[PDB]
Design a protein around this nucleic acid. Sequence first.
RNA 1: GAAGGGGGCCUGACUGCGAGGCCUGCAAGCCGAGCAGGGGCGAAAGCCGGGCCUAGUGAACCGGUGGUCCCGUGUGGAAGG
RNA 2: GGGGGAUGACCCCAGGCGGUAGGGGAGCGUUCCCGAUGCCGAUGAAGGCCGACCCGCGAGGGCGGCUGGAGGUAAGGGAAG
RNA 3: CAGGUGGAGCCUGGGAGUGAGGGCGCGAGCGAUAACGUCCGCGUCCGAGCGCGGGAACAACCGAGACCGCCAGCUAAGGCC
RNA 4: AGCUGUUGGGAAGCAGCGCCAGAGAGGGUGAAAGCCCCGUAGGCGAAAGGUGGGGGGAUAGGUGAGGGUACCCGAGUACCCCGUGGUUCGUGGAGCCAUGGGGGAAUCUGGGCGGACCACCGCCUAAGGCUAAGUACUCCGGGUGACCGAUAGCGCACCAGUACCGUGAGGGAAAGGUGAAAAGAACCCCGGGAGGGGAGUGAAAUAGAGCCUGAAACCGUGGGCUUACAAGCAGUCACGGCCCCGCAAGGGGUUGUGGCGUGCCUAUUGAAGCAUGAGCCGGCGACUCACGGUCGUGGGCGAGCUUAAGCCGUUGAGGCGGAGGCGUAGGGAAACCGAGUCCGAACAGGGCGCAAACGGCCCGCACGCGGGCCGAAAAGUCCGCGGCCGUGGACCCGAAACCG
RNA 5: GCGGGGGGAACCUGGGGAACUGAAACAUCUCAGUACCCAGAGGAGAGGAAAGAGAAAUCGACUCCCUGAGUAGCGGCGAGC
Lengths: 202, 117, 61, 150
Amino acid sequence: VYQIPVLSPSGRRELAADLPAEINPHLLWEVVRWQLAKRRRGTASTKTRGEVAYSGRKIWPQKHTGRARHGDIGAPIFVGGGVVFGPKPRDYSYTLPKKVRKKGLAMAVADRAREGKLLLVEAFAGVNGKTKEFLAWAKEAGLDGSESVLLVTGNELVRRAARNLPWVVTLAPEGLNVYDIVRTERLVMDLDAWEVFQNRIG
Amino acid sequence: PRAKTGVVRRRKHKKILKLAKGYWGLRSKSFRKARETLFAAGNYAYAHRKRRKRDFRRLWIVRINAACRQHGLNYSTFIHGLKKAGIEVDRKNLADLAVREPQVFAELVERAKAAQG
Amino acid sequence: PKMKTHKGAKKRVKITASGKVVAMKTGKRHLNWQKSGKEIRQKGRKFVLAKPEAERIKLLL
Amino acid sequence: MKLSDLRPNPGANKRRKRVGRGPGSGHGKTATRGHKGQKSRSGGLKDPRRFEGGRSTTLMRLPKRGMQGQVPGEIKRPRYQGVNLKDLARFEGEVTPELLVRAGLLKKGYRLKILGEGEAKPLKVVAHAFSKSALEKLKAAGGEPVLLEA
RNA sequence: GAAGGGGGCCUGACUGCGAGGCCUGCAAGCCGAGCAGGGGCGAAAGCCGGGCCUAGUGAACCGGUGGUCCCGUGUGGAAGG
RNA sequence: GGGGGAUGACCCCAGGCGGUAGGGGAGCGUUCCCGAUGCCGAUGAAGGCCGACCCGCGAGGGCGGCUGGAGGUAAGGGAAG
RNA sequence: CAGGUGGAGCCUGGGAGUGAGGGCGCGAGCGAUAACGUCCGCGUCCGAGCGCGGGAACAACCGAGACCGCCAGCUAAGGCC
RNA sequence: AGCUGUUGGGAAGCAGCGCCAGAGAGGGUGAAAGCCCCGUAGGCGAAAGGUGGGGGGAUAGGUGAGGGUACCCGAGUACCCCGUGGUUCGUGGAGCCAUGGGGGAAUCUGGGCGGACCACCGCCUAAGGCUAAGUACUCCGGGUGACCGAUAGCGCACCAGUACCGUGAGGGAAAGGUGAAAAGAACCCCGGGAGGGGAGUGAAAUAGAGCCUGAAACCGUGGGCUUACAAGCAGUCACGGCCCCGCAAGGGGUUGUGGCGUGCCUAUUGAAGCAUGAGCCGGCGACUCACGGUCGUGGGCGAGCUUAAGCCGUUGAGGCGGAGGCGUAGGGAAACCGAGUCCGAACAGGGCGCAAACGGCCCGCACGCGGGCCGAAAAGUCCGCGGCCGUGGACCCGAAACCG
RNA sequence: GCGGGGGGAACCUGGGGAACUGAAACAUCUCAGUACCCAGAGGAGAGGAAAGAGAAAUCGACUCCCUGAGUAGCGGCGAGC
Ligand SMILES: [Mg+2]
Ligand SMILES: [Mg+2]
Ligand SMILES: [Mg+2]
Ligand SMILES: [Mg+2]
Ligand SMILES: [Mg+2]
Ligand SMILES: [Mg+2]
Ligand SMILES: [Mg+2]
Ligand SMILES: [Mg+2]
Ligand SMILES: [Mg+2]
Ligand SMILES: [Mg+2]
Ligand SMILES: [Mg+2]
Ligand SMILES: [Mg+2]
Ligand SMILES: [Mg+2]
Ligand SMILES: [Mg+2]
Ligand SMILES: [Mg+2]
Ligand SMILES: [Mg+2]
Ligand SMILES: [Mg+2]
Ligand SMILES: [Mg+2]
Ligand SMILES: [Mg+2]
Ligand SMILES: [Mg+2]
Ligand SMILES: [Mg+2]
Ligand SMILES: [Mg+2]
Ligand SMILES: [Mg+2]
Ligand SMILES: [Mg+2]
Ligand SMILES: [Mg+2]
Ligand SMILES: [Mg+2]
Ligand SMILES: [Mg+2]
Ligand SMILES: [Mg+2]
Ligand SMILES: [Mg+2]
Ligand SMILES: [Mg+2]
Ligand SMILES: [Mg+2]
Ligand SMILES: [Mg+2]
Ligand SMILES: [Mg+2]
Ligand SMILES: [Mg+2]
Ligand SMILES: [Mg+2]
Ligand SMILES: [Mg+2]
Ligand SMILES: [Mg+2]
Ligand SMILES: [Mg+2]
Ligand SMILES: [Mg+2]
Ligand SMILES: [Mg+2]
Ligand SMILES: [Mg+2]
Ligand SMILES: [Mg+2]
Ligand SMILES: [Mg+2]
Ligand SMILES: [Mg+2]
Ligand SMILES: [Mg+2]
Ligand SMILES: [Mg+2]
Ligand SMILES: [Mg+2]
Ligand SMILES: [Mg+2]
Ligand SMILES: [Mg+2]
Ligand SMILES: [Mg+2]
Ligand SMILES: [Mg+2]
Ligand SMILES: [Mg+2]
Ligand SMILES: [Mg+2]
Ligand SMILES: [Mg+2]
Ligand SMILES: [Mg+2]
Ligand SMILES: [Mg+2]
Ligand SMILES: [Mg+2]
Ligand SMILES: [Mg+2]
Ligand SMILES: [Mg+2]
Ligand SMILES: [Mg+2]
Ligand SMILES: [Mg+2]
Ligand SMILES: [Mg+2]
Ligand SMILES: [Mg+2]
Ligand SMILES: [Mg+2]
Ligand SMILES: [Mg+2]
Ligand SMILES: [Mg+2]
Ligand SMILES: [Mg+2]
Ligand SMILES: [Mg+2]
Ligand SMILES: [Mg+2]
Ligand SMILES: [Mg+2]
Ligand SMILES: [Mg+2]
Ligand SMILES: [Mg+2]
Ligand SMILES: [Mg+2]
Ligand SMILES: [Mg+2]
Ligand SMILES: [Mg+2]
Ligand SMILES: [Mg+2]
Ligand SMILES: [Mg+2]
Ligand SMILES: [Mg+2]
Ligand SMILES: [Mg+2]
Ligand SMILES: [Mg+2]
Ligand SMILES: [Mg+2]
Ligand SMILES: [Mg+2]
Ligand SMILES: [Mg+2]
Ligand SMILES: [Mg+2]
Ligand SMILES: [Mg+2]
Ligand SMILES: [Mg+2]
Ligand SMILES: [Mg+2]
Ligand SMILES: [Mg+2]
Ligand SMILES: [Mg+2]
Ligand SMILES: [Mg+2]
Ligand SMILES: [Mg+2]
Ligand SMILES: [Mg+2]
Ligand SMILES: [Mg+2]
Ligand SMILES: [Mg+2]
Ligand SMILES: [Mg+2]
Ligand SMILES: [Mg+2]
Ligand SMILES: [Mg+2]
Ligand SMILES: [Mg+2]
Ligand SMILES: [Mg+2]
Ligand SMILES: [Mg+2]
Ligand SMILES: [Mg+2]
Ligand SMILES: [Mg+2]
Ligand SMILES: [Mg+2]
Ligand SMILES: [Mg+2]
Ligand SMILES: [Mg+2]
Ligand SMILES: [Mg+2]
Ligand SMILES: [Mg+2]
Ligand SMILES: [Mg+2]
Ligand SMILES: [Mg+2]
Ligand SMILES: [Mg+2]
Ligand SMILES: [Mg+2]
Ligand SMILES: [Mg+2]
Ligand SMILES: [Mg+2]
Ligand SMILES: [Mg+2]
Ligand SMILES: [Mg+2]
Ligand SMILES: [Mg+2]
Ligand SMILES: [Mg+2]
Ligand SMILES: [Mg+2]
Ligand SMILES: [Mg+2]
Ligand SMILES: [Mg+2]
Ligand SMILES: [Mg+2]
Ligand SMILES: [Mg+2]
Ligand SMILES: [Mg+2]
Ligand SMILES: [Mg+2]
Ligand SMILES: [Mg+2]
Ligand SMILES: [Mg+2]
Ligand SMILES: [Mg+2]
Ligand SMILES: [Mg+2]
Ligand SMILES: [Mg+2]
Ligand SMILES: [Mg+2]
Ligand SMILES: [Mg+2]
Ligand SMILES: [Mg+2]
Ligand SMILES: [Mg+2]
Ligand SMILES: [Mg+2]
Ligand SMILES: [Mg+2]
Ligand SMILES: [Mg+2]
Ligand SMILES: [Mg+2]
Ligand SMILES: [Mg+2]
Ligand SMILES: [Mg+2]
Ligand SMILES: [Mg+2]
Ligand SMILES: [Mg+2]
Ligand SMILES: [Mg+2]
Ligand SMILES: [Mg+2]
Ligand SMILES: [Mg+2]
Ligand SMILES: [Mg+2]
Ligand SMILES: [Mg+2]
Ligand SMILES: [Mg+2]
Ligand SMILES: [Mg+2]
Ligand SMILES: [Mg+2]
Ligand SMILES: [Mg+2]
Ligand SMILES: [Mg+2]
Ligand SMILES: [Mg+2]
Ligand SMILES: [Mg+2]
Ligand SMILES: [Mg+2]
Ligand SMILES: [Mg+2]
Ligand SMILES: [Mg+2]
Ligand SMILES: [Mg+2]
Ligand SMILES: [Mg+2]
Ligand SMILES: [Mg+2]
Ligand SMILES: [Mg+2]
Ligand SMILES: [Mg+2]
Ligand SMILES: [Mg+2]
Ligand SMILES: [Mg+2]
Ligand SMILES: [Mg+2]
Ligand SMILES: [Mg+2]
Ligand SMILES: [Mg+2]
Ligand SMILES: [Mg+2]
Ligand SMILES: [Mg+2]
Ligand SMILES: [Mg+2]
Ligand SMILES: [Mg+2]
Ligand SMILES: [Mg+2]
Ligand SMILES: [Mg+2]
Ligand SMILES: [Mg+2]
Ligand SMILES: [Mg+2]
Ligand SMILES: [Mg+2]
Ligand SMILES: [Mg+2]
Ligand SMILES: [Mg+2]
Ligand SMILES: [Mg+2]
Ligand SMILES: [Mg+2]
Ligand SMILES: [Mg+2]
Ligand SMILES: [Mg+2]
Ligand SMILES: [Mg+2]
Ligand SMILES: [Mg+2]
Ligand SMILES: [Mg+2]
Ligand SMILES: [Mg+2]
Ligand SMILES: [Mg+2]
Ligand SMILES: [Mg+2]
Ligand SMILES: [Mg+2]
Ligand SMILES: [Mg+2]
Ligand SMILES: [Mg+2]
Ligand SMILES: [Mg+2]
Ligand SMILES: [Mg+2]
Ligand SMILES: [Mg+2]
Ligand SMILES: [Mg+2]
Ligand SMILES: [Mg+2]
Ligand SMILES: [Mg+2]
Ligand SMILES: [Mg+2]
Ligand SMILES: [Mg+2]
Ligand SMILES: [Mg+2]
Ligand SMILES: [Mg+2]
Ligand SMILES: [Mg+2]
Ligand SMILES: [Mg+2]
Ligand SMILES: [Mg+2]
């Protein structure tokens, strides 16, 4: 995909990008599965019959009692007993092939460009971290908060400015991940952020 | 996450308890005795649907074998008559004809013994 | 945990290039004051069959 | 592309086998373990790959690989790894046992020995040993040193 | 029409192998042409890798004994394999 | 299974379709997560009690009435006490 | 060598369950030309067809292999005071 | 940084015009609030006590070359032997470190070690002591959750290690919810009270304090149908009556007669079986997870594939990290050789091993060739998913017992 | 005059130290230097500045993680470690 519109105070030029021809919605899905898997807290636990509080004493003789047949009340048959095969803390992360992380990141951008919802811009002008100021610049740029925007820029102040918009997820350039791209309709980067993203792939 | 029984079990029990409406004693009150009964009723219906077909034909025959015994005739011969008479009608079911349309039956009796007498 | 190679198996069995399990031949070093020279001589290696599938499975690693 | 659009390809994500549930599930009651005794029991059987039910197993064959090692351990000695001519046919310049690791053929713990299979090339190939067939194959084109320093 | 009886020389009661099969759950058990080495009997064709045949048998492990190349824990040996 | 190039889930045609231990294949529902700064909701959430109605082979899903009085959560996916 | 396209055959692999059978017929052994006895062989059914018809009732004798519906028809065994 | 109108018991809902945002996390407020309340982003704060591994400053302390002398260099010690322990080493060829017993040195030309022993070549200086950090844990405080939500979660959400049981060690529970607000029902009537009936509060009082929702077993009151010459796994298929709904045809309820009819589960060759289990209802209750392996499968990259621990980064943002692993060569006990190798005297024989797959574009003669190219595919490897296996309590429950 | 004494969830070092179980019996082996008892320490404890490694004329205290590696070996050469 090559037809990507840059945005300078001089005029809305056009930049050409390499970006893969076709996308792989599976690989894309695979990366997202991973991104959300690793961030899992894996913090759900339960107690086994050995970790329960009760004594180990046999509850009744075992014969001639006329009752059923038991050992300790920490057994899972008992109400208040241990839990069979319940959850313990565990690490849901795995190591998704790096060559795949790249691809997916690339394709995710491509897909956005392929539909023209991608946009590179320059210096903004609506900086000095104030949402009203950005919000003003955003207007003059087309972003009217009619669709969700993923703002990728290294500039600390611009992010402060956008952060609080319920339709804006703002992110640093080294933070570019595919999940955030696919949640947001529009993709808006600056040039000093397209460069880093450019060197990430390949 | 823990998925407790919640609401599911009570529902399945309600479904069957409703199908067991009108049954005797617990067979309509206890989910268990109800489900056992339904098993029974399930096979009875199925078997009894296949033998409802029998029980009627049986009836039709008796009805017929009587109306043509009025005209001096074995059901057994009457049928053979119509067989050779070409008359693949009667459809034994249609012997209310023998009850609603006597004259129309009598005429059939004639065409009956007419062939192979 | 890490599975453990079966040292008894490793000491007396070999896996070939094509995944065959090649073992020595039984019954030739103990009671041969005279078995036929043909008998004692026919002791090279052989191939276990459809049950080296099991031997293979305790060496894997 | 959208979050409600992701999903994966047909398979890739099969549905675990939830057995021991209800009938017509296919695997209920006996939970696919079929009545039985030992195997159906919890801890189940001993270990099929070895246990033969009391009879001597096939631990009845005699080790040959005589020399199993003794207590101080494995004896240090130069291990040679062979790489074929066909393999290094991709290189043009030098070829040193060092370079051949980076390429992904040598492996760091072994000394270099080039073998026959393949066709030679007019380059300077540095190694620890050469195969009969290999020394000839390339002597008809290029030149090659033998290593033994430090 | 010998596998039985008699005599003459001899030791193939060989070494290195083995096409192909019998049997067979495994492991075993069985038969075996042919090639090579060096032989025995025979004029020769040839036969000979014990015995008319089918029982006289014991996986592995652990050690003993005689060889032989092979390994020998810094190295030469040695210990031990 | 073979057709008719809709290529499915369409119409044809012809066959198979008892079933325990078991193998295989499709689905239904429960809890939780993304979808959610969203959407449904006091003109009434969840749950409950009816139903002769609608959809699905079935598991179920609807819809309507009464109760209840504050939650619920699509499509598409993900994970399991 | 031919016919035989069949929930046939063969090859490689993943998953099994079974390794307590039983009645009957036929062929033998054991037993007493005893057992609803026992042990094999070849078949069959029940097992898993305790679904359907006949046999008064009755897993295995006779008939017959139940996808679903019909207040239609022909039959099987067996029957028709 | 927000007011108004509107429905409503209640506005935060809907509507109309606005505003803040370095703050659109969240929790309250009569229902659903960025802008009402508490917070949130961003900042700020210690007289006193604790800390202070960071910056600064002191003090202790530390720092020479050559030549000669042979003075010192950790004793019941090294060393040897017997008995044992530790190490992967279970007496093994058994070293090393430790030491209960016996014997018992030396001080640089001294001693220990490199897996019996000897030589050679090297390593190191035993028998005195101290030493931050990187590491382990969580009574305690905090922050997070594809963690529980009152049979769950700690044994305990509630004055629980309590009641209660036990001589004692010890065992050990149950038990949460009116309403937005007590406005928690003055007074009157029946009653000894309890309780109820009016009145009254409330949006609601089958929200009335044995209080949210209020299922099932279970017990009642009323009504429809039905039953005292019929006999049975209780149903089912038919007809008919009577009651209800509907214009309608149809349907719902009940059951008089007729036909058919051996509960469920389990275990068995075989069960209605006079074989096991179950009074009934509600809730709890059993194929898991980790790490390896072996298949299959979805993808990535392919003679390559891939990182681990860590480091950096981080609104639940990713990246770096190539130690390492698997694969690319096999055969042999090994030395070793190698597309071969092993057995062998063999240039017999055999064992186990090596052999680039398609299309198409280029050329050497034209229809392929011969070898190359362009990329389809792929050995291999990596992650996900699924079957199964190994090890772990490994589907859940249950002993008689053993030991501290 | 100075100090000790006793207590602390787990963690740590030391002194002692099982059995069930596994080996589909059992004694060596395993479980396991585990459980547990005792002493002691502290916010940590241990360890620590080579009479070390071990084949490289090599490295340089100790602790901890990854790897080396289920390798080297150990082993009724069994189970297994
Ligand atoms: Mg306890
Ligand atoms: Mg307790
Ligand atoms: Mg316990
Ligand atoms: Mg006890
Ligand atoms: Mg009882
Ligand atoms: Mg309790
Ligand atoms: Mg609990
Ligand atoms: Mg997993
Ligand atoms: Mg990970
Ligand atoms: Mg990481
Ligand atoms: Mg935002
Ligand atoms: Mg449940
Ligand atoms: Mg009825
Ligand atoms: Mg019929
Ligand atoms: Mg006819
Ligand atoms: Mg002999
Ligand atoms: Mg499935
Ligand atoms: Mg199945
Ligand atoms: Mg089944
Ligand atoms: Mg199975
Ligand atoms: Mg069972
Ligand atoms: Mg059995
Ligand atoms: Mg049993
Ligand atoms: Mg158990
Ligand atoms: Mg067991
Ligand atoms: Mg035995
Ligand atoms: Mg003779
Ligand atoms: Mg002679
Ligand atoms: Mg052969
Ligand atoms: Mg023999
Ligand atoms: Mg003989
Ligand atoms: Mg043994
Ligand atoms: Mg020996
Ligand atoms: Mg030996
Ligand atoms: Mg030597
Ligand atoms: Mg050494
Ligand atoms: Mg030596
Ligand atoms: Mg020896
Ligand atoms: Mg020897
Ligand atoms: Mg088609
Ligand atoms: Mg059909
Ligand atoms: Mg079927
Ligand atoms: Mg299938
Ligand atoms: Mg589902
Ligand atoms: Mg959300
Ligand atoms: Mg609304
Ligand atoms: Mg209202
Ligand atoms: Mg309502
Ligand atoms: Mg819910
Ligand atoms: Mg419904
Ligand atoms: Mg409702
Ligand atoms: Mg209401
Ligand atoms: Mg939802
Ligand atoms: Mg729901
Ligand atoms: Mg879903
Ligand atoms: Mg469960
Ligand atoms: Mg043929
Ligand atoms: Mg078949
Ligand atoms: Mg097969
Ligand atoms: Mg298999
Ligand atoms: Mg048996
Ligand atoms: Mg048997
Ligand atoms: Mg038998
Ligand atoms: Mg049979
Ligand atoms: Mg039979
Ligand atoms: Mg019988
Ligand atoms: Mg006869
Ligand atoms: Mg008999
Ligand atoms: Mg019998
Ligand atoms: Mg027969
Ligand atoms: Mg059976
Ligand atoms: Mg039958
Ligand atoms: Mg059958
Ligand atoms: Mg019966
Ligand atoms: Mg019957
Ligand atoms: Mg009958
Ligand atoms: Mg019958
Ligand atoms: Mg059929
Ligand atoms: Mg049919
Ligand atoms: Mg007829
Ligand atoms: Mg007939
Ligand atoms: Mg009769
Ligand atoms: Mg009003
Ligand atoms: Mg207002
Ligand atoms: Mg508004
Ligand atoms: Mg925020
Ligand atoms: Mg309300
Ligand atoms: Mg509220
Ligand atoms: Mg709202
Ligand atoms: Mg809303
Ligand atoms: Mg608020
Ligand atoms: Mg508002
Ligand atoms: Mg702050
Ligand atoms: Mg202040
Ligand atoms: Mg501060
Ligand atoms: Mg201070
Ligand atoms: Mg300092
Ligand atoms: Mg300082
Ligand atoms: Mg000084
Ligand atoms: Mg001096
Ligand atoms: Mg001096
Ligand atoms: Mg000293
Ligand atoms: Mg010594
Ligand atoms: Mg010594
Ligand atoms: Mg000693
Ligand atoms: Mg020892
Ligand atoms: Mg021993
Ligand atoms: Mg030894
Ligand atoms: Mg030793
Ligand atoms: Mg020792
Ligand atoms: Mg020594
Ligand atoms: Mg010592
Ligand atoms: Mg000593
Ligand atoms: Mg010296
Ligand atoms: Mg040393
Ligand atoms: Mg040495
Ligand atoms: Mg000695
Ligand atoms: Mg040293
Ligand atoms: Mg010292
Ligand atoms: Mg210290
Ligand atoms: Mg805490
Ligand atoms: Mg929950
Ligand atoms: Mg909740
Ligand atoms: Mg409770
Ligand atoms: Mg509780
Ligand atoms: Mg509750
Ligand atoms: Mg606690
Ligand atoms: Mg409790
Ligand atoms: Mg308390
Ligand atoms: Mg008392
Ligand atoms: Mg007391
Ligand atoms: Mg309550
Ligand atoms: Mg309240
Ligand atoms: Mg409230
Ligand atoms: Mg009064
Ligand atoms: Mg009152
Ligand atoms: Mg009132
Ligand atoms: Mg009022
Ligand atoms: Mg009301
Ligand atoms: Mg009242
Ligand atoms: Mg109510
Ligand atoms: Mg009440
Ligand atoms: Mg209420
Ligand atoms: Mg109550
Ligand atoms: Mg409430
Ligand atoms: Mg209530
Ligand atoms: Mg009544
Ligand atoms: Mg009478
Ligand atoms: Mg009467
Ligand atoms: Mg009676
Ligand atoms: Mg009845
Ligand atoms: Mg009726
Ligand atoms: Mg009616
Ligand atoms: Mg009747
Ligand atoms: Mg009846
Ligand atoms: Mg009857
Ligand atoms: Mg039984
Ligand atoms: Mg029995
Ligand atoms: Mg029996
Ligand atoms: Mg009974
Ligand atoms: Mg009994
Ligand atoms: Mg019973
Ligand atoms: Mg029993
Ligand atoms: Mg039972
Ligand atoms: Mg009983
Ligand atoms: Mg009772
Ligand atoms: Mg229940
Ligand atoms: Mg796994
Ligand atoms: Mg797997
Ligand atoms: Mg950091
Ligand atoms: Mg491998
Ligand atoms: Mg090799
Ligand atoms: Mg090898
Ligand atoms: Mg040789
Ligand atoms: Mg040789
Ligand atoms: Mg050869
Ligand atoms: Mg070959
Ligand atoms: Mg490919
Ligand atoms: Mg692949
Ligand atoms: Mg398992
Ligand atoms: Mg137990
Ligand atoms: Mg005791
Ligand atoms: Mg102290
Ligand atoms: Mg103390
Ligand atoms: Mg003390
Ligand atoms: Mg200790
Ligand atoms: Mg200790
Ligand atoms: Mg002590
Ligand atoms: Mg000790
Ligand atoms: Mg023991
Ligand atoms: Mg075991
Ligand atoms: Mg045992
Ligand atoms: Mg055992
Ligand atoms: Mg025993
Ligand atoms: Mg041990
Ligand atoms: Mg202590
Ligand atoms: Mg620390
Ligand atoms: Mg320390
Ligand atoms: Mg120390
Ligand atoms: Mg020192
Ligand atoms: Mg030093
Ligand atoms: Mg040995
Ligand atoms: Mg050990």
